[PDB]
Design a protein around this ligand. Structure first.
Ligand SMILES: [Cl-]
Ligand SMILES: [Cl-]
Ligand SMILES: [Cl-]
Ligand SMILES: [Cl-]
Ligand code: NA
Length: 129
């Protein structure tokens, strides 16, 4: 599913990401834009053999099980395929664990490099929320 920007903003708000660990909703929308282009089916294999999954590109090294990341953890207790759903619930619940882990949103390389310190409210401008 390729979400519309305000569609995703409303789903993220509904599932509790607005000001979660102090990150306003535009941070999460911007992160998803640059991580997945709002595509829930996005996947990208990392050089070390882990894979990032879904709208927030959650990594199999720590967070989900894909059966092909040796020595990895599954700290969100989910199959990585659950992160590819049209239903963003599993991605949002797991993102909450990731952003609580000590580095905040710097866990998302695209957020650090492309969203951090920018006008992130622009990402929710025009959305009825
Ligand atoms: Cl939309
Ligand atoms: Cl915002
Ligand atoms: Cl594995
Ligand atoms: Cl923080
Ligand atoms: Na894993």
């Amino acid at each position: 599913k390729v979400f519309g920007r305000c569609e995703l903003a409303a789903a993220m708000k509904r599932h509790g990401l607005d000001n979660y660990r102090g990150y306003s909703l535009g941070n999460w929308v911007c992160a998803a834009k640059f991580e997945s282009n709002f595509n829930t089916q996005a996947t990208n294999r990392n050089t070390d053999g882990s894979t990032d999954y879904g709208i927030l590109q959650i990594n199999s090294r720590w967070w989900c099980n894909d059966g092909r990341t040796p020595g990895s953890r599954n700290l969100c207790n989910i199959p990585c395929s659950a992160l590819l759903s049209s239903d963003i619930t599993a991605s949002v619940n797991c993102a909450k664990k990731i952003v609580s882990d000590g580095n905040g949103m710097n866990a998302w390389v695209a957020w650090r490099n492309r969203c951090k310190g920018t006008d992130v409210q622009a990402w929710i401008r025009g959305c009825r929320l």
